Design a protein around this ligand. Structure first.
Ligand code: GTP
Ligand code: GTP
Lengths: 178, 185, 438, 32, 50, 37, 438
């Protein structure tokens, strides 16, 4: 893939910490005054990537700028769209679990997200619609994460959000008035 | 070629005092010459490339066409002495789309031409020892609206008086430059 | 409607156009007098003819063409020939001089005071046309006089009308045969002036058709009469899709779009399979399989190229004659099965079939055959760059000794045009090999 | 070595070789 | 351009049957012949159609 | 091997049609070591 | 469907083919125009004639034969004859030099630049044909220009087509007539070059044909017109099974299988039974028993080998006309009960019988009779070795004094190949000796 070679070449000053069996990280140059447009989706390609030690960077940094960078995602969303569905087609259980987690954090991160995402469901949803039900130690139940995603989504999405999600998902239920 | 090396710092590709500096520079000699001769102002050996026709005789990088350049830095500086003649040079790069593209700086050029695979630029300048400066991302952004990513080859033509070509990430000032970079007459 | 304009320049360029307009009066039976037999076709002028000839209520077809030249010899001989009553009187524009093979002489010195009149005539043709898809240009690379004038005309036509395609036919310089050593110069000038505004250029060479005439037509001493006849058949076969119809119909806009891939490279090569004597076709057989194999047969192509060396990128075929679709697609499937022909890995479909049923026409006193099936094949490939290699490694040396440049510089050009051209040529060959690279 | 195969004496050497000479009187009939 | 059907079976209007002063129905609309032109009558009388 | 005229003329000519000219039919169609050279 | 090709080489190998087609046109009612009467008979070449003629929609029945020669004389004369309008023009292939009876000259010096064209013709028939059951090659062992050229083209077709039959028919070296002194050389060379690829080869002797013509045809001053007429009726008899039908039919595959026991020896003899003068047939009778007696009569065979010198392995009987299974089997039963003929003990049954209804045909201006019951006979036997023995010692004596080897080495060859040919023919012989020995 392209992001792995991009960093193997090197343009991201990110530091780290580490110990016996667990997790932690650092960085070298701050993100807010570097960029959220020229580097956000390129780094997101690491999500579709699955290889040590690159996935560490992906899984964490994706959260990191989410906490640290709220009022900038506004225009970058169509660029964000692509690696999402690429990883979804990649069809790996662990990868899609990591996705589900980070996408959960994405939607809850800030405002305006669902309303701007209005044009952008018919590509992300239906593959999940079919992922619904193939199947708490470390949050491993695919189906539970799926219903959590739909739950956190629809109420914040808006008004016809649920009806279009329903049109995707014939099981789908209301979390609003039932 | 040497991708494993560090784009950090400065990249002198050719520098005159090198004993045998022509490895990765394929030469195409025709009705011309390559010569290695001192100057009067720097009174130091420099390269001289001349020929009857400039398209016939030209130096290029890399030597193996089956190899790329592999450079990230978007800033280029050449140390040239104008010789009151007809010189040009060429660079080819790979972009955000992964389609190849060329830039053609020609001293004669009477106009500016944009072709889907290559851009052209006239060169006019003073005499004596002067300098070249260019920004790959700048020009690609302005012309093709794409985003510079890496370099793949570079070619230089005749009618030129040569000290050093080098690359840098940014527009560097005049004081961080080493003494050999700090040209004096 | 589906009507256009024919433009002819250069005393070598005019005999071929003359033959073409003959073959265009043939099929609709336009008498050399100007009016039909007692049988009726005249009126407001709305049928297969209203595209080539304007026969308004006057009863005389007016060909929608203009012939221009600088040397009055050929234009006056055609003024005094057979079809002068048919040719519009001042549609035959004459100069009083020659360009002495100097491109810039033909461009600057004299062209300034004639472009006004020629553009006036073409605009007054524009008023009478309705759709006017465009123009058929007849000229030559090594234009002994017409090259520069034609380049200038094409540029100014481009700057005023940018909303219609241009299909052009220039006779390629003979690779190893030189009629004069000024041809590389004026050729390269024409190339750099035309490649960037020309739409679809087809090259043709005279040596190859000569060798064909001796090869299978079996005539050891061919002529311009014969060669012009054959190329007139070529252009008539292409314009048949315009005039008549069949199963489906195709058009020049499709030709350019489907054939030229990118900007720049729009230079396909021509072939016409069933060239044979009347006595041979009299008791030998013709059908789709063998005629297609012929159109791929290396001797049948009119450019000094090795399709083995090259690789194929696009192809169109126009089938004029009583045929059926299945065996066509079956034969083309067999070609797809074949191995040695090397298509590139970009277009798994690379063919533009066109069907028309009206038989290709014969000429009185001719050396063609009573055709029932014919296919004219156009193809764009990667093997032509070597001819440019030939012409540049011929150019370079004489440029290096700067021979004859005094003529051009004294008349008022500089070296920069030549400079420009040499790297343009290098650029062309390099992009050719690059797109050849997968 | 491939040994030479005997030329088969199916008459011939015996018969035809003798007959081809016996049915001749040339070298005589145009006079000495 | 096509051939034409005289009667039901699939017959075809062979010129051996056409003359002046004839009517004929063709896919509905019926027509009548008035007169012809030079080569037409010359050829047709060369055949000998009265 | 060869199915027809196509593979004949395309495989075995050695007549580099760009190189040669003013030749004749028999010379146009010429094989290789297939024949003896 | 069912069909075969014909190839003719050697300056004297061509008038016989001329005769064969001058025959076929009659019984298929072909006129030297190439057209039938107005009766609905034309298509793509699909009717009774389709087995050897492609009569495309142009209505002309094209013979499926290619006539090649190294010298222009006979070929251009027949091109000036009364069938050039029929024949495919370049299917008559010309050279511009003789061979002077040297095998290696033609096989090496000139053959390499005509074989290409002839192979092109071979394939450009093999494309339109469908079944392609086999070939008929006509040549001459003591070739004036036939030996080397036929050998090399046979080798090329043997290595290009492993899935079809081949037929090789010719005049044999005369036992005691020496029309050209290098005959032993060229003969033995061709024998070795063919033994390892030949399928079925027939050998005939013009002296014996002459003798029959003198004996019972009531003719004493004959010509090739007569002799080639005879070989033509032979070819007609063999191809009748394909031309028409019968109660039972047989195929070239049937002869191939049922006639040759092993590899190697696959060279039979043939005989046409009812050869008779017109008045003789007028005032006697013919029928199955007597015609079979005549066909197995030793002297009416066309090779100077006495059957009582040896013994028979196999026999094929092809009856043209109107006969019945009853009398044919009764007659052959009497044949077997007869004591003179000796069949080898391996196969007590050794008979392959076949029938066709169509009577044999009389040619205008001919000399045959009005026959209604023809029978051709093919025999595979052991008496054949006599000719081989007769040739080998002429070979070895001229080898002993080593004359004209200067010719051969000068044209660039060495003696080890003739050395080979000696023991090669010896090996074929020892094969014959074992198979004869019980
Ligand atoms: N179009 C065409 N070209 C021909 C014919 N016969 C020869 N030629 C070639 O066409 C070229 C003619 O170009 P030029 O001689 O420059 O023609 P021009 O520029 O109109 O002016 P002139 O030099 O006076 O003829 C020659 O190089 C010939 O090789 C022909 O019948 N038609
Ligand atoms: N097939 C055939 N053979 C003939 C005829 N007349 C004589 N012959 C014998 O058949 C042989 C034919 O071979 P060649 O004489 O070498 O003929 P060629 O090889 O075609 O060419 P040339 O060198 O011109 O003779 C002769 O040597 C004769 O002995 C004939 O009409 N037809």
């Amino acid at each position: 893939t392209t992001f792995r070679k991009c960093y193997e070449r090197g343009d991201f000053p990110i530091a780290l910490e580490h110990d016996s069996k667990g997790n932690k990280i650092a960085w070298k140059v701050e993100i807010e005054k570097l960029d959220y447009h020229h580097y956000l989706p390129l780094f997101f390609d690491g999500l579709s990537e699955m290889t040590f030690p690159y996935e560490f960077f992906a899984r964490r940094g994706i959260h990191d700028m989410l906490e640290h960078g709220g009022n900038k995602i506004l225009p970058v969303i169509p660029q964000l769209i692509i690696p999402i569905k690429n990883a979804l087609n990649l069809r790996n259980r662990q990868i899609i679990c990591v996705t589900l987690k980070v996408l959960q954090h994405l939607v809850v991160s800030s405002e305006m997200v669902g309303e701007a995402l209005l044009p952008y469901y018919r590509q992300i949803l239906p593959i999940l619609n079919i992922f619904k039900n193939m199947n708490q130690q470390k949050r491993e139940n695919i189906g539970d994460l799926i219903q959590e995603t739909l739950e956190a989504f629809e109420r914040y999405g808006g008004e016809d959000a649920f009806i279009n999600i329903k049109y995707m998902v014939p099981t789908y239920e209301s979390c609003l008035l039932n | 070629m040497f991708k494993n090396t560090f784009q950090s710092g400065f990249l002198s590709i050719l520098y005159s005092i090198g004993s045998k500096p022509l490895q990765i520079w394929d030469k195409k000699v025709r009705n011309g010459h390559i010569k290695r001769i001192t100057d009067n102002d720097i009174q130091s050996l420099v390269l001289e490339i001349e020929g009857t026709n400039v398209s016939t005789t030209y130096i290029t990088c890399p030597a193996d066409p089956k190899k790329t350049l592999g450079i990230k830095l978007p800033f280029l500086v050449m140390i040239i002495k104008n010789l009151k003649k007809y010189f040009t040079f060429e660079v080819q790069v790979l972009d955000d789309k992964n389609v190849r593209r060329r830039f053609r700086a020609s001293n004669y050029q009477s106009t500016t031409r944009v072709k889907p695979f290559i851009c052209t630029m006239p060169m006019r300048l003073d005499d004596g020892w002067n300098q070249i400066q260019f920004n790959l991302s700048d020009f690609t952004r302005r012309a093709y609206g794409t985003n510079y990513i890496e370099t793949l080859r570079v070619q230089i033509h005749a009618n030129c008086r040569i000290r050093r070509v080098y690359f840098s990430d940014r527009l560097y000032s005049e004081d961080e430059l080493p003494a050999e970079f700090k040209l004096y007459l | 409607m589906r009507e256009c304009i024919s433009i002819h320049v250069g005393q070598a360029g005019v005999q071929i156009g003359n033959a073409c307009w003959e073959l265009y009066c043939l099929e609709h039976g336009i008498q050399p007098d100007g009016q039909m037999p007692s049988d009726k076709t005249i009126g407001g002028g709305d049928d297969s003819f209203n595209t080539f000839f304007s026969e308004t209520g006057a009863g005389k077809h007016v060909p929608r063409a203009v012939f221009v030249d600088l040397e009055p010899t050929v234009v006056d001989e055609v003024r005094t020939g057979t079809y002068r009553q048919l040719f519009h009187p001042e549609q035959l524009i004459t100069g009083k001089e020659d360009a002495a093979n100097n491109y810039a002489r033909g461009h600057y010195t004299i062209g300034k005071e004639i472009v006004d009149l020629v553009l006036d005539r073409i605009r007054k043709l524009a008023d009478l046309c309705t759709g006017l898809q465009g123009f058929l240009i007849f000229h030559s690379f090594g234009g002994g006089t017409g090259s520069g004038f034609a380049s200038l005309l094409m540029e100014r036509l481009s700057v005023d009308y940018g909303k219609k395609s241009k299909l052009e036919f220039a006779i390629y310089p003979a690779p190893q045969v030189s009629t004069a050593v000024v041809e590389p110069y004026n050729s390269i000038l024409t190339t750099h002036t035309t490649l960037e505004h020309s739409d679809c250029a087809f090259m043709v060479d005279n040596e190859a058709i000569y060798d064909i005439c001796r090869r299978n037509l079996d005539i050891e001493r061919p002529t311009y009469t014969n060669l012009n006849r054959l190329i007139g058949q070529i252009v008539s076969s292409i314009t048949a899709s315009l005039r008549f119809d069949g199963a489906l119909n195709v058009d020049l806009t499709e030709f350019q779009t489907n054939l030229v891939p990118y900007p720049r490279i729009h230079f396909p090569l021509a072939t016409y399979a069933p060239v044979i004597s009347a006595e041979k076709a009299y008791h030998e057989q013709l059908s789709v399989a063998e005629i297609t194999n012929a159109c791929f047969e290396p001797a049948n192509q009119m450019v000094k190229c090795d399709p083995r060396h090259g690789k194929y990128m696009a192809c169109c075929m126009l089938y004029r004659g009583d045929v059926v679709p299945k065996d066509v697609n079956a034969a083309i499937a067999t070609i797809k099965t074949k191995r040695t022909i090397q298509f590139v890995d970009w277009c798994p479909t690379g063919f533009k079939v066109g069907i028309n049923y009206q038989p290709p026409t014969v000429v009185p006193g001719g050396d063609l055959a009573k055709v029932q099936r014919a296919v004219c094949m156009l193809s764009n490939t990667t093997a032509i760059a070597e001819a440019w290699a030939r012409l540049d490694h011929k150019f370079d040396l004489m440029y290096a000794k700067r021979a004859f440049v005094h003529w051009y510089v004294g008349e008022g050009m500089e070296e920069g045009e030549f400079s420009e051209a040499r790297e343009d040529l290098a650029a062309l060959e390099k992009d050719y090999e690059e797109v050849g690279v997968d | 070595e491939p040994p030479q195969h005997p030329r088969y004496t199916s008459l011939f050497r015996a018969t035809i070789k003798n007959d081809m000479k016996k049915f001749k009187t040339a070298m005589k009939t145009m006079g000495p | 351009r096509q051939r034409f059907t005289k009667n039901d079976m699939g017959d075809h209007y062979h010129w051996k049957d056409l003359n002046r002063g004839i009517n004929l129905t063709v896919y509905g609309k019926t027509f009548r012949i008035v007169d012809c032109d030079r080569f037409t009558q010359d050829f047709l009388e060369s055949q000998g159609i009265e | 091997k060869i199915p027809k005229d196509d593979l004949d003329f395309r495989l075995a000519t050695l007549y580099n049609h760009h190189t040669g000219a003013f030749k004749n039919k028999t010379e146009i169609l010429l094989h290789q070591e297939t024949i003896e050279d």
